Amino acid sequence: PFVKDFKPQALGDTNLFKPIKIGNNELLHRAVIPPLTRMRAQHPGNIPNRDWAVEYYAQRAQRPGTLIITEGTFPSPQSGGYDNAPGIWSEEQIKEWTKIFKAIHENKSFAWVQLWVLGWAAFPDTLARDGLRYDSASDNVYMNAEQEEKAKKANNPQHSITKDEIKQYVKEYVQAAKNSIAAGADGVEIHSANGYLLNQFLDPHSNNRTDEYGGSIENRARFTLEVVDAVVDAIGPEKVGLRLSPYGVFNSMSGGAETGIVAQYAYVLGELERRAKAGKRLAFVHLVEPRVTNPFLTEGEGEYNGGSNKFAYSIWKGPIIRAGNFALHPEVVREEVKDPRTLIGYGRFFISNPDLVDRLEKGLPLNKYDRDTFYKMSAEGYIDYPTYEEALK
Ligand SMILES: Cc1cc2nc3c(=O)[nH]c(=O)nc-3n(C[C@H](O)[C@H](O)[C@H](O)COP(=O)(O)O)c2cc1C
């Protein structure tokens, strides 16, 4: 069951096992569950899975004081376009989320909803079935030839969203954030990473707009910062986080090939620190490491060695969550958690190790993960990974 080419290291003696306050939540350790889409939500409805989702989250909440960031969750139908990712717009969805949050809170852990808006990564034929637009920054740059063929075959060509449609998305983020908090979530994370709609605005490849949402660093950051401002004004800065992937190439983003990419992200972080100095500091910034430029590639592939997220620490002075290939690299974690405001997100190995925090504390072998069940409508590879003690039996 265990990864064979990995020699574990106990991290119990590091800042990974020191408490830290994040927003309203007193974490007992700094191992974070990053958002992990599992495609078990039910359709019609985009309902969090009524058989399994509670169990899945409860298992991973088992170490008290754990911050859990939910899978990407759609604020509205128009935000979506994947049938088996959950939403948080409807009473049927909110009923299931409430049970999830209850389960996480019964284990004295924390639940943060990631708010996800797809843009050009949506399936345009699924959107067309539901009478929805296929939305992005650009009126003419497609994510790839496959997306362009699907959009044209469905007569659902990519729509460059207008100012009024941007404002509607901001209102949907706000309402979805309020639904999250009312249902019991500890906070929300705004997904501005991995090539989805807000990242499509930030990135100069995807954004060739000629209005105030494109054509400059400041203009490409506008949508992301309007969402952050609206959600912070609605629910409070202590209940809001942001996720960015400066070096990501997933979903046809530029990454380090774009020489202006660090300036673009530096500007976003500077504007967050400016808000913080005005009394509105976000709970955290969540950065994907250049260790993982594409989460569809195996650990050690799609590594970008040309850049680092260290710049972020000179600009943003709040908590930073870093994710990307850390589970198999405790020697890297031991160095990175020397910084007293650094938390570590563990994605793939939290899929396969519900007791990952115990295993990092004590230096236990890790369960291998089964990539074939990352996105399958199955309990198998979802709620049937064993704890270390179960694995030894
Ligand atoms: C199956 C899977 C689903 C993911 N879903 C999401 C998602 O919903 N939102 C998001 O921001 N990142 C998502 N990611 C990216 C992870 O949060 C993480 O940044 C990435 O897996 C790298 O960390 P790791 O090496 O520890 O797995 C996903 C990754 C995987 C493998």
Side-chain angles (χ1 to χ4, degrees), residues 214-266:
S216 70
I217 287 175
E218 296 94 340
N219 282 2
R220 283 200 303 275
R222 187 180 306 287
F223 191 4
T224 294
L225 291 165
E226 284 177 347
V227 174
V228 166
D229 285 343
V231 174
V232 163
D233 284 349
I235 66 169
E238 73 280 8
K239 303 190 185 184
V240 181
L242 185 61
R243 196 168 207 216
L244 301 162
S245 54
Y247 299 104
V249 300
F250 193 56
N251 288 329
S252 309
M253 298 292 103
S254 299
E258 170 57 60
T259 58
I261 209 60
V262 172
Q264 176 72 66
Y265 284 91

Side-chain angles (χ1 to χ4, degrees), residues 3 11-12 21 107 114 120-121 157 175 181 185 258 264 267 334 346 370 374 378:
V3 180
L11 288 167
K21 200 176 165 71
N107 286 275
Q114 187 188 61
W120 72 6
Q175 181 67 52
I181 298 308
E258 170 57 60
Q264 176 72 66
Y267 175 75
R334 179 171 290 277
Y346 296 94
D370 171 31
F374 279 3
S378 63

Side-chain angles (χ1 to χ4, degrees), residues 29-43:
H29 62 82
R30 305 184 186 193
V32 171
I33 314 194
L36 293 160
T37 289
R38 302 305 305 284
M39 299 301 192
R40 267 78 175 175
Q42 296 178 283
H43 199 264

Side-chain angles (χ1 to χ4, degrees), residues 19 35 78 110 142 164 205 212 220 228 359 363 376 382 384:
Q78 180 62 76
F110 309 107
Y142 280 86
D164 284 342
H205 169 68
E212 59 259 53
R220 283 200 303 275
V228 166
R359 300 196 193 209
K376 183 163 182 184
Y382 191 54
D384 67 345

Side-chain angles (χ1 to χ4, degrees), residues 2 29 31 33 38 55-64 66 68 107 109 346-360 365-369 381-391:
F2 303 144
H29 62 82
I33 314 194
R38 302 305 305 284
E55 183 150 17
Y56 171 72
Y57 282 113
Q59 287 175 357
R60 283 152 190 78
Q62 63 180 261
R63 175 90 180 217
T66 305
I68 308 184
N107 286 275
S109 285
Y346 296 94
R348 279 170 287 186
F349 282 92
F350 243 127
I351 291 179
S352 55
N353 296 266
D355 61 337
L356 185 60
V357 179
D358 284 352
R359 300 196 193 209
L360 302 168
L366 299 189
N367 295 349
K368 295 173 304 199
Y369 61 72
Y382 191 54
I383 54 164
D384 67 345
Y385 287 99
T387 65
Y388 179 65
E389 291 302 356
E390 295 166 343

Side-chain angles (χ1 to χ4, degrees), residues 143-196:
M143 187 175 107
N144 61 37
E146 178 151 25
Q147 292 287 77
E148 185 170 352
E149 175 186 24
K150 287 187 171 167
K152 290 183 174 170
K153 277 200 228 306
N155 192 31
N156 203 16
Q158 189 173 285
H159 174 70
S160 187
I161 56 174
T162 64
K163 287 167 206 52
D164 284 342
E165 290 158 350
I166 289 162
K167 293 344 194 326
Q168 180 64 27
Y169 273 116
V170 172
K171 288 172 168 179
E172 293 174 354
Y173 273 110
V174 170
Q175 181 67 52
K178 290 189 151 213
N179 292 348
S180 297
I181 298 308
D186 294 281
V188 303
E189 181 184 80
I190 296 158
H191 190 349
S192 187
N194 298 340
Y196 298 100

